């Protein structure tokens, strides 16, 4: 039963390590790693801060041309949850070292594929902090 | 090796997603709460607030306004993984301003049925 298999420590460790790689790649604009970690499927999607992208080829195309400026941020809060052995969500709140009056949220859903853990869908947005 | 969009699973999840959307438009708070995973781990990144845990999400729904306006759906992507997991992602326009809404959910099949384990909604300005 899946609800007796929330945050199994070995699975949670695995997902957390890949999430850490993703965050480091994001801040250094390591596009190879950012693409590696997204599920290579037409179903994968990314709702970015400024665009909606459908399918791995569109997301990888977008990362190729995106500017490496104003990427740095501090993570304020993190919740990674795993379900059984093969599925997880990763959610963070962040603040960009630049833009002062907004707080950022990033959400991912991760799946264990035959090539390792991959992001199947993601969503990033910034909202006004009261 | 998770099987994608198995037909029974994909139909089931789609039917619960439709229940959720109809409850949003009618402000049927009981159904909106029923469909969220009853766990401290559940979270909801709303258009204007971040809520952590079922009790906070349910409290927020119960006390908010009958405001949630109708949407025109631009695109819907519902994907299932094996028998017990899914994602539901929609792009929408509120029938209001010129913003483009995005709503993302992840669903799990619990012992009480399909539930939302995490969700995120945001509105952005896209060029026309």
Numbering used by the authors:
A (entry chain B): 1 to 130
B (entry chain A): 3 to 97, 99 to 131
What do the study authors state?
We obtained the X-ray crystal structure of the AtzH. Differential Scanning Fluorimetry (DSF) was used to estimate the stability of the protein and showed that the native protein had a Tm of 57.2°C. Well diffracting crystals of AtzH grew readily, and two different space groups were observed: P1 and C2221. Analysis with PISA gives an interfacial surface area of almost 3,200 Å2 (or about 29% of the total surface area of the protein). The AtzH active site was sought by examining the X-ray structure. However, an in silico docking simulation between the X-ray crystal structure of the AtzH dimer and 1,3-dicarboxyurea elucidated a potential active site. The arginine residues form an extensive hydrogen bonding network with the carbonyl oxygens of 1,3-dicarboxyurea. Tyr22 is positioned within 3 Å of the carbonyl carbon of one of the two terminal carboxylic acids, and Arg46 is within hydrogen-bonding distance of the hydroxyl group of Tyr22.
AtzH is the first DUF3225 family protein that has been shown to possess a catabolic function, likely decarboxylating the product of AtzEG-mediated deamination of 1-carboxybiuret as part of the cyanuric acid mineralization pathway. The data presented here imply that AtzH is a decarboxylating, 1,3-dicarboxyurea amidohydrolase. AtzH belongs to NTF2-fold superfamily, which contains 38 protein families, including the AtzH family: DUF3225 (DUF: domain of unknown function). Size exclusion chromatography performed on AtzH after removal of the his-tag, suggested that the native protein had a molecular mass of ~ 29 kDa, consistent with a dimer (2 x 14,655 kDa).
